Enzyme design. Structure first.
Site, mmCIF file in Angstrom:
data_model
loop_
_atom_site.group_PDB
_atom_site.id
_atom_site.type_symbol
_atom_site.label_atom_id
_atom_site.label_comp_id
_atom_site.label_asym_id
_atom_site.label_seq_id
_atom_site.Cartn_x
_atom_site.Cartn_y
_atom_site.Cartn_z
ATOM 1 N N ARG A 1 38.752 46.365 36.496
ATOM 2 C CA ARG A 1 39.711 47.452 36.661
ATOM 3 C C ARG A 1 39.627 48.426 35.501
ATOM 4 O O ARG A 1 39.723 49.643 35.697
ATOM 5 C CB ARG A 1 41.134 46.902 36.779
ATOM 6 C CG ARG A 1 41.379 46.117 38.046
ATOM 7 C CD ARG A 1 42.764 45.498 38.001
ATOM 8 N NE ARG A 1 42.788 44.322 37.127
ATOM 9 C CZ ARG A 1 43.894 43.656 36.816
ATOM 10 N NH1 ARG A 1 45.069 44.059 37.296
ATOM 11 N NH2 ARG A 1 43.824 42.578 36.036
ATOM 12 N N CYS B 1 41.412 45.081 31.131
ATOM 13 C CA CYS B 1 42.212 44.469 32.168
ATOM 14 C C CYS B 1 42.048 42.965 31.998
ATOM 15 O O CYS B 1 42.040 42.427 30.883
ATOM 16 C CB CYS B 1 41.801 44.914 33.574
ATOM 17 S SG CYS B 1 40.080 44.726 33.874
HETATM 18 C C1 LIG Z 1 34.817 39.037 36.918
HETATM 19 N N1 LIG Z 1 35.248 38.522 38.264
HETATM 20 C C2 LIG Z 1 34.123 38.877 39.261
HETATM 21 C C3 LIG Z 1 35.402 37.003 38.251
HETATM 22 C C4 LIG Z 1 36.652 39.223 38.637
HETATM 23 C C5 LIG Z 1 36.512 40.670 39.037
HETATM 24 C C6 LIG Z 1 37.819 41.350 39.213
HETATM 25 C C7 LIG Z 1 38.265 42.138 40.274
HETATM 26 N N2 LIG Z 1 39.561 42.560 39.996
HETATM 27 C C8 LIG Z 1 39.901 42.000 38.782
HETATM 28 N N3 LIG Z 1 38.837 41.291 38.326
HETATM 29 C C9 LIG Z 1 37.375 38.425 39.810
HETATM 30 O O1 LIG Z 1 36.753 38.537 40.910
HETATM 31 O O2 LIG Z 1 38.434 37.908 39.547
#
Ligand SMILES: C[N+](C)(C)[C@@H](Cc1cnc[nH]1)C(=O)O
Ligand SMILES: [Cl-]
Ligand SMILES: [Cl-]
Ligand SMILES: [Mg+2]
Length: 429
Positions: free
Chosen positions: A390, A385
């Site tokens: 995801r 993703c």
């Molecule tokens: C990897 N981080 C924690 C920065 C992501 C996690 C995430 C949740 N849904 C898509 N990505 C974010 O919060 O954008």
């Protein structure tokens, strides 16, 4: 037609209808029972072969009729309801009849008659014991005998992304919190190095032989916030489950539906800030399951291999390059050659993999939709993703089905697009 008195269908009649395209067999038990948990002590758990899941819990959902329609359950179908008891079906039978379904029957003898005879076909989620119901967690933390558990050491871990309030506002009793930053790096948004993972797991009290039960709290992510991921706690929980299984925690469980399932079951909530009980040694080389993770050079090889695919678990606006999905990614587009598997509405929601109550979507529906795109267990699949969250939740759903070669391509669109030499596509395909 009687809205409140329902025709019984006999075992013999239902047996003769198992292959009928015009009959929809509806299991109104919990999704966890449907998946295979033997919630009443039945010797064979799971569902009648071909049955769909429609938990009676969902009758209070204002969108109940839309759930039914999205499941392709139509008024011209013959509806057969069953549960642990026919009484458990009465309200659902009435609800169908009130919404213009005129062929509705109740099967009275699923348990113990159907479950109790091995010639009556049943199905179940192959690895259902990794996806645990709230009642199982409650028994675990209470020191009570529970099925599918032979360990003597456990920890319940509440995942969040830089949001301790998600835990402090209410958590499962005795649970401790794990920020996702403990196991993944903000520089790469990939899993940390083996030495860092070893230290972080030890400091959170986790050994390779600890049963780790992960869950998070859904707090209605809003794309206008600086960190919407801080509200997507249960995606984060499954992300940590992926990293822990990669690292080598032998027994990782995910509470199905996250925190909502705990409170929906009526169990007590705690707001204590529980101190960690550190352990001195993780007890296994990290990573023990490296095949669970795919990095960019292997991902590129899989795009050139007949038996392998990358599976893009992003939103449709991300896929066509309308948006990046994130306030920390500027580049928009997609990895060429990946198979699209729409996650849901944006980067912080997984509506196509979940029910409204955040439990995993009926696994047959996931399996059948995936198959239409050639996403099938005979392939080596790397789900991905934006940066791995995801993708981890999609990966976990395939793992639960027993798929033998499923991974997460960790770097995702973040890593791919960060190299301007990597090709990408944009626009409607
Ligand atoms: C990897 N981080 C924690 C920065 C992501 C996690 C995430 C949740 N849904 C898509 N990505 C974010 O919060 O954008
Ligand atoms: Cl979530
Ligand atoms: Cl992509
Ligand atoms: Mg990543």
């Amino acid at each position: 037609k009687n809205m409140y008195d329902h025709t019984e269908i006999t075992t013999d009649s239902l047996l003769a209808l198992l292959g009928s395209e015009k009959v929809k067999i509806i299991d109104v038990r919990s999704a966890d029972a449907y998946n295979g948990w033997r919630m009443r002590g039945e010797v064979r758990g799971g569902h009648i072969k071909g049955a769909k899941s429609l938990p009676a819990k969902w009758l209070t959902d204002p969108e109940w009729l839309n759930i039914v329609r999205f499941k392709q359950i139509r008024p011209e179908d013959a509806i057969v309801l069953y549960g642990y008891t026919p009484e458990e079906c009465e309200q659902t039978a009435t609800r169908f009849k009130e919404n213009g379904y005129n062929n509705v029957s109740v099967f009275h003898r699923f348990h113990p008659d159907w479950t109790g005879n091995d010639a009556f076909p049943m199905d179940r989620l192959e690895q259902y014991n990794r996806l645990v119901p709230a009642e199982w967690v409650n028994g675990l933390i209470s020191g009570e005998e529970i099925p599918e558990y032979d360990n003597d050491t456990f920890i319940v871990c509440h995942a969040h992304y830089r949001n301790r309030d998600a835990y402090l506002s209410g958590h499962i009793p005795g649970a401790t919190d794990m920020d996702t930053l403990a196991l993944e790096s903000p520089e790469t948004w990939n899993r940390r190095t083996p030495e860092e993972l070893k230290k972080a797991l030890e400091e959170h009290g986790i050994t390779a032989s600890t049963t780790v039960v992960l869950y998070g709290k859904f707090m209605h992510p809003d794309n206008a916030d600086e960190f919407p991921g801080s509200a997507a706690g249960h995606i984060g929980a499954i992300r940590l489950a992926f990293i822990m299984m990669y690292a080598g925690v032998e027994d990782v469980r995910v509470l199905n539906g996250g925190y909502q399932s705990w409170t929906d079951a009526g169990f007590a909530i705690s707001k204590d800030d529980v101190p960690k009980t550190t352990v001195p040694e993780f007890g296994a080389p990290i990573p023990s399951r490296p095949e669970f993770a795919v990095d960019i050079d292997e991902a590129k090889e899989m795009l050139q291999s007949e038996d392998s695919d990358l599976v893009c678990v992003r939103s449709y606006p991300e896929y066509i390059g309308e948006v990046s999905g994130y306030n920390y990614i500027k580049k928009k587009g997609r990895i060429p050659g990946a198979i699209f598997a729409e996650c849901g509405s944006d980067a912080y929601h997984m509506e196509n993999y979940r029910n409204h109550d955040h439990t995993t979507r009926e696994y047959h529906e996931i399996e059948d939709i995936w198959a239409k795109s050639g996403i099938i267990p005979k392939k080596h699949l790397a789900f991905y993703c934006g940066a791995g969250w995801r993708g981890s939740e999609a990966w976990f759903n395939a793992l639960l089905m027993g798929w033998p070669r499923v991974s997460v391509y960790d770097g995702g669109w973040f890593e791919w697009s960060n190299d301007p030499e990597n090709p990408y596509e944009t626009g409607v395909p």
